[PDB]
């Protein structure tokens, strides 16, 4: 696309600048360009891709939730009719969010996942796939909602199976996957008990492996463990 004429290394360099500038839409466009060069991504480059799109979609999700809350108050008893505008604007934001999710899913399908053989890369991309189907599920209503939820579940489950076989229980990628799959269970799949069990099991298995870690790896792992604990505290 518009990045086709820019060097791969320059796209990555500019993604890093955009991050520093808090220009996340630019960051995401640079990283899309880098992916579309066709080469596999390094660990650092995967992280840049993730950060860029997570920030873009996160802003959209936050706006969607504000608009949805105004829309659902408009649809209460005793609410004055104010016309189509709230729905139309919610729809506009929703369609943009869906477009971003579709963009990310398209990068994963063409061709990041199929070229990813190492557990670090494959788990990362499958977790991403689950996340972006999860964001689609948050706004889905209507006939494909079940299928979207199933797509998220399937991606997460494939990532889980690989991570349990190939990574230690403290690996930050494995931990973040488990965190996000637990969120899926609680918030999307109407399975709070599964969410709680996964978070508990994950936390406890990681605890038991901390003794193997350097000081720096310990800090990395315990940061995510704390998030599992924060959700457990919220959910119980």
């Amino acid at each position: 696309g518009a990045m086709g004429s820019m060097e791969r290394a320059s796209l990555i360099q500019k993604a890093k600048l955009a991050e520093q500038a808090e220009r996340y839409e630019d960051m995401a466009a640079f990283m899309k360009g880098a992916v579309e060069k066709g080469e596999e991504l390094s660990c650092e480059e995967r992280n840049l891709l993730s950060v860029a799109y997570k920030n873009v979609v996160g802003g959209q999700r936050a706006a969607w939730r504000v608009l949805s809350s105004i829309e659902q108050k408009s649809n209460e008893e005793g609410s004055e009719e104010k016309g189509p505008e709230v729905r139309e604007y919610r729809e506009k934001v929703e369609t943009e969010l869906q477009g971003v999710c579709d963009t990310v899913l398209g990068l994963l399908d063409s061709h990041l996942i199929k070229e990813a053989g190492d557990a670090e890369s494959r788990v990362f991309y499958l977790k991403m796939k689950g996340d972006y189907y999860r964001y689609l599920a948050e706004v889905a209503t209507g006939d494909d909602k079940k299928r979207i939820i199933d797509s998220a579940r399937s991606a997460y489950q494939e990532a889980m199976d690989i991570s349990k076989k190939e990574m230690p229980p403290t690996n930050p990628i494995r931990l973040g996957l488990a965190l996000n799959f637990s969120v899926f269970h609680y918030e999307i799949a109407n399975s709070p008990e599964e969410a709680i069990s996964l978070a508990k099991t994950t936390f406890d298995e990681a605890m038991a492996d901390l003794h193997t870690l350097s000081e720096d790896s310990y800090k990395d792992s315990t940061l995510i463990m704390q998030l599992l604990r924060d959700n457990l505290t919220l959910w119980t």
């Binding site: 920030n55 996340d131 973040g176 996000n180 969120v183 609680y186 918030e187 959910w235």
Partner: peptide, 8 residues
């Protein structure tokens, strides 16, 4: 509160 997912 909404649940916390993995941060950047």
């Amino acid at each position: 509160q909404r649940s916390t997912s993995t941060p950047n």
